[PDB]
């Protein structure tokens, strides 16, 4: 019984759920909806030299 108890998505003003995998292939699992990584620095600051807001751009 490799039952996994995770946490439920609730408002950030009984909050846990269980999960068991029934199939031998990882393609059969449910979705990875609770992976909330983000790193926008590759599109917004793709600069060779760092830039500070306070300092002049040039």
């Amino acid at each position: 019984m490799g039952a996994q108890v995770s946490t439920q998505k609730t408002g950030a003003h009984t909050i846990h759920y269980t999960n068991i995998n029934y199939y031998k292939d990882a393609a059969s699992n449910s979705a990875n909806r609770q992976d909330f990584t983000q790193d926008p620095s590759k599109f917004t600051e793709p600069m060779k030299d760092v830039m500070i807001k306070s300092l002049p751009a040039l």
Binding site: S41, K42, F43, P46, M47, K48, D49, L58
Partner: peptide, 9 residues
């Protein structure tokens, strides 16, 4: 020059 942009980082 302005600076150098490196691809997607």
């Amino acid at each position: 020059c302005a600076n150098v942009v490196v691809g997607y980082g």
